[PDB]
Write a protein that holds these residues in place. Structure first.
Motif, PDB file in Angstrom:
ATOM      1  N   UNK A 181       0.960  -1.316  -0.017  1.00 14.38           N
ATOM      2  CA  UNK A 181       0.069  -0.046   0.055  1.00 14.38           C
ATOM      3  C   UNK A 181       0.920   1.371  -0.010  1.00 14.38           C
ATOM      4  N   UNK A 182       0.514   2.211  -1.010  1.00 11.62           N
ATOM      5  CA  UNK A 182       1.308   3.418  -0.977  1.00 11.62           C
ATOM      6  C   UNK A 182       0.335   4.576  -0.509  1.00 11.62           C
ATOM      7  N   UNK A 183       0.849   5.437   0.250  1.00 10.93           N
ATOM      8  CA  UNK A 183       0.419   6.585   0.730  1.00 10.93           C
ATOM      9  C   UNK A 183       0.665   7.620  -0.289  1.00 10.93           C
ATOM     10  N   UNK A 184      -0.064   8.915  -0.391  1.00 14.16           N
ATOM     11  CA  UNK A 184       0.034   9.879  -1.182  1.00 14.16           C
ATOM     12  C   UNK A 184      -0.036  11.226  -0.654  1.00 14.16           C
ATOM     13  N   UNK A 185       1.326  11.909  -0.775  1.00 13.30           N
ATOM     14  CA  UNK A 185       1.602  13.124  -0.348  1.00 13.30           C
ATOM     15  C   UNK A 185       0.699  14.179  -0.912  1.00 13.30           C
ATOM     16  N   UNK A 186       0.003  15.324  -0.395  1.00 15.68           N
ATOM     17  CA  UNK A 186      -0.768  16.330  -0.939  1.00 15.68           C
ATOM     18  C   UNK A 186      -0.013  17.473  -0.168  1.00 15.68           C
ATOM     19  N   UNK A 187      -0.478  18.679  -0.437  1.00 18.74           N
ATOM     20  CA  UNK A 187      -0.168  19.967  -0.085  1.00 18.74           C
ATOM     21  C   UNK A 187       0.049  21.298  -0.962  1.00 18.74           C
ATOM     22  N   UNK A 188      -0.303  20.575  -2.319  1.00 21.02           N
ATOM     23  CA  UNK A 188      -0.093  21.790  -3.615  1.00 21.02           C
ATOM     24  C   UNK A 188       1.232  22.037  -3.369  1.00 21.02           C
ATOM     25  N   UNK A 189       1.573  23.253  -3.697  1.00 23.11           N
ATOM     26  CA  UNK A 189       3.085  23.823  -3.783  1.00 23.11           C
ATOM     27  C   UNK A 189       3.630  24.456  -2.347  1.00 23.11           C
ATOM     28  N   UNK A 190       2.560  24.169  -1.421  1.00 22.23           N
ATOM     29  CA  UNK A 190       2.970  24.764  -0.120  1.00 22.23           C
ATOM     30  C   UNK A 190       3.920  24.007   0.944  1.00 22.23           C
ATOM     31  N   UNK A 191       4.957  24.278   1.243  1.00 25.01           N
ATOM     32  CA  UNK A 191       5.881  23.625   1.793  1.00 25.01           C
ATOM     33  C   UNK A 191       5.544  23.090   3.234  1.00 25.01           C
ATOM     34  N   UNK A 192       4.838  24.137   3.891  1.00 24.72           N
ATOM     35  CA  UNK A 192       4.307  23.554   5.434  1.00 24.72           C
ATOM     36  C   UNK A 192       3.427  22.459   5.327  1.00 24.72           C
ATOM     37  N   UNK A 193       2.466  22.665   4.305  1.00 25.36           N
ATOM     38  CA  UNK A 193       1.353  21.653   4.163  1.00 25.36           C
ATOM     39  C   UNK A 193       1.977  20.214   3.572  1.00 25.36           C
ATOM     40  N   UNK A 194       2.906  20.276   2.857  1.00 24.38           N
ATOM     41  CA  UNK A 194       3.734  19.283   2.415  1.00 24.38           C
ATOM     42  C   UNK A 194       4.346  18.518   3.602  1.00 24.38           C
ATOM     43  N   UNK A 195       5.022  19.146   4.441  1.00 24.22           N
ATOM     44  CA  UNK A 195       5.362  18.752   5.891  1.00 24.22           C
ATOM     45  C   UNK A 195       4.300  17.938   6.476  1.00 24.22           C
ATOM     46  N   UNK A 196       3.336  18.595   6.877  1.00 22.82           N
ATOM     47  CA  UNK A 196       2.404  17.878   7.557  1.00 22.82           C
ATOM     48  C   UNK A 196       1.818  16.707   6.926  1.00 22.82           C
ATOM     49  N   UNK A 197       1.618  16.892   5.592  1.00 19.23           N
ATOM     50  CA  UNK A 197       1.148  15.683   4.899  1.00 19.23           C
ATOM     51  C   UNK A 197       2.228  14.389   5.028  1.00 19.23           C
TER      52      UNK A 197
END
Ligand code: CL
Ligand code: CL
Ligand code: ZN
Ligand code: ZN
Ligand code: ZN
Ligand code: ZN
Lengths: 369, 369
Positions: free
Chosen positions: A184-200
């Motif tokens: 099972x693969x998870x998928x990182x979201x957050x668009x282009x925003x660094x902080x969201x990518x980190x939380x994801x």
């Protein structure tokens, strides 16, 4: 072989080469995964001959026809199509958004772009569908973010995506046969925003997956922006698991993603391009329909090792494509997919030999001459 | 091998089996010749694997695109398409009548069904075009007769056809490379009228050809009438040369033509039928699109030896055809052509063993059950 074992054999800067072992076989990474559903003009044996270790199946296409439950009855997808190696299935989420014609915390209800029939897709149902298909690598069901997105909309979709990732995780774990034989693969979201990518990324790693996809790119942001987002995004993902850039892409895009630490790729370009007359070459893509190839006796590409370049001329393929002949699509597609596998092979070789950076430079000089 | 040598190994009543030797290879007769131009969904190697000894090329299609002169420049048709065995080319006459949009004793002028471009076709030009293509078996250029035809119109067309046959003969003989390496077939006309068929045959044998086609059938007369015309027509042709029934046809038609002394066949049915979902089986044709095959796990046919029946189910092909997937046409066509070669093989074997009559009966009982 084990259920799933990712091993890294060599590294160069952020680039990695190695292998994923799965019950149905070994996948060499970095890897290109030809789309096995969606033009569909090759026999499985032919796809394997181009060098593919794994193919991708579109859940959305298959749930509509012939239907997930029917595929299971028939013996599953591998058996149905005659491909016995690993298969990665997408969740169906993306296509429901783009190809289909109501969203909720539970999931999504929609009408088929075909007969206007109704269907629901939730994390649980998507996971169940992928099980019924018999897929080896299962993608968590998530909620896509359009480009461009506001920080607020990106945050909310990413947050829902993490909740759905946990639901995907649990649904997959509760099915014994699936949990024991698939990944099972998870998928990182957050668009282009660094902080969201980190939380994801933190959220995905907390849940725990066999692999991590970077989602939300190749959706109209451009290569500069894409690369910029990969720059900060990939290092957030666990280093010891595969990184999968979904929907990418053009050869130059692939080369740059690998330099930024991506291990896995899929794209409709080689198959789609095939039908439209675009052939990939080391000197850049060409459109075989162009009049300049009408009497050109050379193969599609001067170095390519594929069966098409050994046997047929540009002049002949120019004719097949312009005349609407099915053979034309068959040969352009076999060559394009073969070219993509040769690209990944040169990437893996160059990383193994510590000269990938030099290969990337030489590749671009010629490809963009 | 020689330029052309037809040898008859065994006979049963009017049926014959044997071989044609030509520089590019041996043709087993009775023979089915898959159409190599006109759906075009198979690689040459695949066509050869079904068992074909020879393929047919459509002159009309090729003179329009990519053009006879261009094909010669490129190295000829065998080289262009990657088929190194014999090729029989039609004269272009039929298609000019049906596919094109002014007749004279000299020939025919016409506009392309494509770009409305103008072209002439005469016995001399057709023969020259077939030379430029590099064809191994060349068909004389003739004037077709519509069904039904009056005795007067049939007489006149047949008579013009015999004059054009002589012109075809001479044009072919005056070109050294063509006369020394290729063969020329004459074509009997006369519609359904015995006396005209006799004059045509006498005229053709007087001129002298390597083979004799029976023209003017399979044009809407029905099987009873066709067989009736073959009954008196084939014995008029020289017994020691191949007899070629143009545009036939359905399996039952082929079996009956052989019983009446035909040695060679061509038809678009197996390729055309392929795309439309019709598969030939020993129990009669089926339409794979039918809902009854949606979960049918059996191969297209239970005895067929083709690669498609070894590897894929009706259920899967049903899906490919209904979904418009190119692979669907590829597999239906490979199977249909393979089925036709297996039919000719059973015919040749049965004649060789003196049990063709019994085979014809058993074939029909099952095929039409
Ligand atoms: Cl499919
Ligand atoms: Cl062609
Ligand atoms: Zn499909
Ligand atoms: Zn190639
Ligand atoms: Zn063509
Ligand atoms: Zn078959």
């Amino acid at each position: 072989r084990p259920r799933f074992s990712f091993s890294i054999a060599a590294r160069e800067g952020k680039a990695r080469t190695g292998t994923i072992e799965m019950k149905r076989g070994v996948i060499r990474t970095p890897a290109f995964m030809p789309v096995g559903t969606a033009v569909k003009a090759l026999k499985p044996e032919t796809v394997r001959a181009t060098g593919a270790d794994i193919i991708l199946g579109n859940t959305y296409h298959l749930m509509l026809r012939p239907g997930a439950e029917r595929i299971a009855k028939l013996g599953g997808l591998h058996s149905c199509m005659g491909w016995d190696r690993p298969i990665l299935t997408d969740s169906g989420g993306y296509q429901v958004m783009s190809l289909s014609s109501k969203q909720s915390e539970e999931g999504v209800t929609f009408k088929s772009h075909l007969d206007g029939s109704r269907h629901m897709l939730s994390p649980e149902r998507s996971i169940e569908i992928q099980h019924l298909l018999g897929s080896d690598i299962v993608m968590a069901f998530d909620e896509s973010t359009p480009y461009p997105a506001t920080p607020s909309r990106a945050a909310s979709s990413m947050e829902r995506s993490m909740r759905w990732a946990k639901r995907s995780r649990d649904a997959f774990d509760s099915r014994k046969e699936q949990a024991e034989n698939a990944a099972l693969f998870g998928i990182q979201q957050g668009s282009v925003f660094e902080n969201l990518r980190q939380q994801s990324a933190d959220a995905l790693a907390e849940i725990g997956f066999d692999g991590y996809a970077v989602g939300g790119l190749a959706v109209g942001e451009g290569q500069d922006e894409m690369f910029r987002v990969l720059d900060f995004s990939v290092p957030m993902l666990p280093d010891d698991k595969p990184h999968y850039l979904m929907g990418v892409g053009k050869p130059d895009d692939i080369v740059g993603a690998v330099e930024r630490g991506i291990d896995m790729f899929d794209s409709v370009l080689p198959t789609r391009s095939g039908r439209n007359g675009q052939a990939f070459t080391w000197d850049g893509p060409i459109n075989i329909r162009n009049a300049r190839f009408s009497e050109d006796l050379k193969p599609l590409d001067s170095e390519c090792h594929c069966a098409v370049c050994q046997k047929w001329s540009r002049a002949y393929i120019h004719h097949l494509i312009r005349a609407g002949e099915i053979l034309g699509a068959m040969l352009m597609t076999e060559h394009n997919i073969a070219f993509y596998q040769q690209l990944m092979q040169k990437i893996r070789d160059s990383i193994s030999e510590g000269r990938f950076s030099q290969f990337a430079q030489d590749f671009r000089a010629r490809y963009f001459a």
